[PDB]
Write a protein that binds this DNA or RNA. Structure first.
Lengths: 114, 100, 146, 54, 156, 47, 124
RNA sequence: GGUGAAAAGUACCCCGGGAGGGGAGUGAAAGAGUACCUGAAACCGUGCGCUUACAAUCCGUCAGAGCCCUCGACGUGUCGUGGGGUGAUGGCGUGCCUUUUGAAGAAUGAGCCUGCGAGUCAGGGACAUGUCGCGAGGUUAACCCGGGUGGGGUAGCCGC
RNA sequence: AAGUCCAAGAGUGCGGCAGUGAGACGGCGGGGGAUAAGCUCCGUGCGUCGAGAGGGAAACAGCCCAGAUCGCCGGCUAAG
RNA sequence: GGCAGCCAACGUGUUGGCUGGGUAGGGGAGCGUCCUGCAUCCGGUGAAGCCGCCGAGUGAUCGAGUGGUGGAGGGUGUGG
């Protein structure tokens, strides 16, 4: 098994789907390429995703003593976390529900020999 | 050589050493059962006359009596409330043919 | 357990039927039988275990009665009033193989396996076909008597 | 109008998969002796120092 | 639903809202509403005939007698001070079964106190003798006064 | 001896309550009342 | 004596969900929707189990008819001849011979043709 | 409403502005981290296996090709009384409920899951169906006494 | 008089505990209608569906065959 | 071949032979849940619950079979 390091960004104030939109971009790529794509991705969800990927890389470097250049985004996924319920008033005094969703973005970077 | 053997209201193509599941036979595991043959084929000699077949008998050892697949019946008729749940496991007997 | 065709035990054979002065329906029935593989003891309805059937002289098919002018082949394009009808005679003149093709296809089952079976039919509006390399067997439509 | 049936999972996901981001095409740019990845669109700006590469 | 607080007012109109018709927020289907056929306080006692009760008690005691589970004792402890030690030793002498019904007179407070704290021992008076206790007890240890009182009460 | 766990009702003494309206395998749905009517929801007076 | 009905409910729910495991969509996930299909699934199982005998007899008959006409005899006359000859081989094993033992099937065809009347269409 | 037995409530370091994590430590257990006992379903992902872009599917069921694991003859991959999946293809196949003469019905209800949600109780009530006691008798009500479910209590009731 | 013979699950009487009291079509005998209606109202030890699956009627409650206790890698047939 | 009332038997009456589509509805017999009298078992050497594996029963359903999670109760019998 490849030496892996984990990083979970929990309760991120972004939808699980909107985090997944960029996690799909940077799943499978090396850590460096993933961070570059998340740097130049126009989606705002790329910033928490980039931060959690970089945290996984930092854990691999410091807590695990792995070579940062050999790291790769092995398994990354955003699960949906808690959802706050808000009320938006609409016409005729009718209250519609608004969902302030969060996401847990889990990242596991492995150190693979190219 | 093989034979179309009659047993349990059904016929089975069996050669010496063939293992066949058939209806339940009143015989112990390890006992021997002689079964009438609907046909015998020896390479090219096809014994099919009833007079000649009455002489032939497929001998088979009873390996064990087993139960078939669990059949689950749910007789349902819509808009009547009629459900009937039922189960079934046929009692089968496994025979290893020893000779013909 | 009943025999089931496994992997590649389905052997295929090539037949060539001369459609000259033969009834369209009889030829199509025999060709559909061959394309299904109903003529083989290993026939299984869910298996395309049929045989390739070349039909030569499709233009020289025979139709009784007035089917050559009174029978029509219809096609709707999906547009309003888009029903085009072409008599059997006109169809045999313009696309001669299409009459035999349509007969055989209609006599074949209408499903995915039927359309897979269709690919083994080779209708030609002439005495010759390009599949001589397949060494097709001349198939004469013969009735088994009782 | 209003959806008449609940959309099946298969259809919902088949058509939801179309809401995907397109990864930017990154080219290499040498700035401050370092090889960074920037869009070819921002290649000139990065060379001139008008891109914040952090 | 009538005893649950609130619920007097109809929750909303009968028609128009597009919701199910409700006549009370405390209707049974509602969360927090009343219980339809729930328990209500009731007296479960039965008016079993006197002859039935007495015959059942006599049958239980007869079973104990037939199985030699009935014992008689002058008292449970010697002296005026109760002693569960002495009572336990004497009961062990009498029987070894776990549960024993001790049937002693009311004035036998010394014996009652002496024997009452033994785990399986149950103490009653001859006048309150009953089939439940007799059957629950493996043995029945009567005092002599208690046995004579029971016999007199049931024979005279 | 006869202990409390040896006590049982007389054969045929106790009978299960007819718990009505519990699935179609028993007296379910209408609970023996049949389809609509007065008797579907109440008792008709004897008089 | 309040009773919570989760223990009892989840039993049948798990039964139906495990039975409907493999169904597409709501039928494998939701007990209520699985239950509707499970009614249909078991009704179909009963019906198809009754009809499987007919389906397999149809398959055997098709194979026997193919083998018979390959032997130059129709299936109906083959069956007539076998009955006249007293051959009591069921269509299952007749098809088994047709596929695995064509020589034996040809021998049976010869027996049936010999047992057939001199004129099958005669008023007899 | 529920961390843990005890805050022992995670020092210190690292990524991060934080939030949140990763090491480390506490703890029997952080598969107990003040979002905390267990942690179901719905619902939402990620990974793997099969399948699927010529196909008309109440979504299943019966056959069923092709694609991995449990014991062995044999010595090694082709079998088996064997044992799960995935489903090319073929046949059959008109949801459930209510209510109707009749509904797949284009009639009603249900978006889904979980939890709750409907013949129950009182009374010597009334009418019919096993047991105590009789021998023509059964019973007691109120009430009295008993620290109980036991003992008394004949008024009355029903048979006569 | 027999026949139905391990009885029809028969008839009768008394207590069960009911629901049912919206029927449908088809064949025969009729009324109303125009001797129309998939009309309506009657009769029919007439049938079927209701409450009935299975096979045939392409599909198709009422037509035809036939009344599903459950299984079977069996056989004979019904209407077709 | 497997399962559900009546008949014969000689003897302990459980063996053999004659038997069953179903809505309203009636009768019978049961499954599962909780709480309990008594009896008896299991449980921090891991109860319940939950997710499985392997199976099982004619049905409701089963699991003193078993793995994982779990952390304190639970099972069985006979009665209420």
């Amino acid at each position: 098994e490849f030496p892996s390091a984990t990083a979970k960004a929990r309760y991120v104030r972004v939808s699980a789907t909107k985090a997944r939109r960029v996690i799909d971009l940077v799943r499978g790529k090396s850590v460096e390429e993933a961070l570059d794509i998340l740097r130049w991705a126009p989606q705002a969800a790329s910033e928490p995703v980039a931060k959690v990927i970089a945290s996984a890389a930092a854990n691999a470097q410091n807590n695990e003593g792995l070579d940062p250049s050999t790291l790769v985004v092995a398994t990354v996924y955003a699960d949906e976390g808690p959802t706050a319920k808000r009320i938006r008033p609409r016409a005729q005094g009718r209250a519609f529900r608004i969902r302030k969703r969060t996401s847990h973005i889990t990242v596991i970077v492995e150190s693979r020999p190219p | 050589t093989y034979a179309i053997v009659k047993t349990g209201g059904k016929q089975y193509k069996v050669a010496a050493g063939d293992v066949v599941k058939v209806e339940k036979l009143d015989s112990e595991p390890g006992a021997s059962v002689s079964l009438p043959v609907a046909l015998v084929v020896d390479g090219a000699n096809v014994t099919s006359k009833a007079d000649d077949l009455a002489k032939v008998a497929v001998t088979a050892e009873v390996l064990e009596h087993t139960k078939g697949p669990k059949i689950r019946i749910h007789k349902f008729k819509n808009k009547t409330g009629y459900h009937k749940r039922q189960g079934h496991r046929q009692q089968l007997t496994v025979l290893k043919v020893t000779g013909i | 357990p009943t025999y089931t065709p496994k992997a590649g035990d389905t052997t295929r054979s090539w037949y060539v039927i001369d459609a000259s002065d033969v009834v369209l329906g009889r030829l199509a029935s025999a060709a559909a039988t061959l394309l299904r593989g109903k003529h083989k003891p290993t026939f299984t309805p869910n298996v395309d275990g049929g045989d390739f059937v070349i039909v030569i002289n499709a233009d020289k098919i025979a139709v009784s009665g007035d089917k050559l002018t009174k029978k029509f082949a219809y096609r709707h394009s999906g547009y309003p009033g888009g029903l085009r009808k072409r008599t059997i005679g006109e169809l045999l003149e313009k696309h001669p193989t299409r009459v035999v093709e349509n007969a055989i296809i209609g006599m074949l089952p209408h499903n995915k396996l039927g359309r897979q079976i269709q690919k083994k039919l080779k209708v030609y509006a002439g005495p010759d076909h390009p599949h001589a390399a397949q060494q097709p067997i001349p198939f004469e439509i013969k009735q088994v008597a009782q | 109008a209003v959806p008449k049936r609940r959309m099946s999972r298969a259809n919902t996901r088949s058509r939801r998969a179309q809401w995907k981001a397109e990864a930017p095409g990154l080219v290499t740019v040498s700035v401050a002796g370092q090889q960074r990845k920037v869009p070819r669109r921002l290649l000139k700006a990065a060379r001139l120092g008008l891109v914040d590469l952090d | 639903r009538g005893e649950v607080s609130g619920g007097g007012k109809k929750p909303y109109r009968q028609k128009g809202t597009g919701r199910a018709r409700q006549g009370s927020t405390r209707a049974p289907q509602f969360t927090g509403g009343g219980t339809v056929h729930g328990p209500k306080p009731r007296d479960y006692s039965q008016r079993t005939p006197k002859k039935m009760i007495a015959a059942a008690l006599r049958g239980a005691l007869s079973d104990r007698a037939r199985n030699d589970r009935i014992h008689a004792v002058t008292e449970l402890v010697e002296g005026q001070t109760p002693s569960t030690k002495s009572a336990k030793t004497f009961l062990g002498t009498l029987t070894e079964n776990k549960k024993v019904l001790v049937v002693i007179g009311r004035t036998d407070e010394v014996g009652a106190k002496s024997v009452r704290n033994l785990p399986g021992v149950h103490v009653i008076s001859p006048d309150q003798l009953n089939t439940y206790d007799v059957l629950n007890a493996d043995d029945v240890v009567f005092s002599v006064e208690a046995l004579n009182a029971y016999i007199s009460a049931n024979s005279k | 001896v006869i202990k409390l766990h040896d006590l049982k009702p007389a054969p045929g003494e106790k009978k299960a309550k007819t718990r009505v309206g519990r699935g179609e395998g028993s007296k379910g749905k209408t609970a023996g009342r049949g389809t609509k009517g007065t008797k579907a929801r109440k008792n008709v007076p004897v008089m | 004596a309040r009773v919570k009905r989760a223990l009892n409910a989840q039993k049948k729910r798990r039964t139906v969900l495990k039975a409907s495991k493999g169904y597409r969509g709501q039928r494998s996930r939701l007990y209520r929707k699985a239950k509707e299909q499970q009614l249909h699934s078991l009704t179909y199982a009963y019906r198809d189990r009754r009809a499987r005998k007919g389906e397999f007899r149809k398959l055997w008959i098709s194979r026997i008819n193919a083998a018979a006409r390959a032997n130059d005899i129709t299936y109906n006359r083959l069956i007539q001849g076998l009955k006249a000859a007293g051959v009591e081989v069921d269509r299952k094993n007749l098809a088994e011979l047709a596929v695995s033992d064509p020589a034996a099937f040809t021998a049976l065809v010869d027996v049936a043709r010999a047992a057939l009347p001199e004129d099958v269409n005669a008023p007899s």
